[PDB]
Nucleic acid binder design. Structure first.
Ligand code: MN
Length: 121
DNA sequence: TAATATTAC
């Protein structure tokens, strides 16, 4: 529906490598992927406190590139280093997004709606 | 976890 607000599941990513593999798992992920930055080689009430975020926007028609661009700005204070946003389909064929964000600084997310996004149509 | 939802290492 027009001008829907999209709320993500926000998690601190436990293993960025596994998350990136997981969100690029589909054979056609290449044309459904937006990327920015350089991948960080990581060394091994609501609150998330991490440099590494794994976001899932269910039932979400946002273009990966525009989700990425807007998350870069919403997370700007934490100095994003790498973002990958990928569209996949639910079983019923409707789209959703997954995003991996790697920041320089640890983000303290206490508002669960902080990464909500509205689509411009 | 909240708070979208069946998608989420
Ligand atoms: Mn998926």
């Amino acid at each position: 529906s027009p001008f829907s607000i999209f709320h993500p599941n926000i998690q601190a990513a436990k293993d960025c490598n596994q998350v990136r593999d997981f969100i690029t798992k589909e054979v056609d992920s290449d044309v459904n992927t937006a990327e920015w930055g350089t991948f960080v080689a990581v060394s091994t009430r609501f609150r998330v406190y991490s440099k590494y975020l794994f976001l899932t926007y269910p039932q979400c028609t946002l273009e990966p590139q525009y989700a990425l661009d807007s998350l870069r700005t919403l997370l700007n204070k934490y100095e994003p280093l790498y973002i990958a946003a990928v569209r996949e389909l639910h079983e019923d064929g409707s789209p959703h997004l997954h995003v991996l964000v790697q920041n320089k600084l640890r983000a303290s997310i206490t508002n669960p709606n902080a990464l909500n996004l509205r689509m411009d149509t």
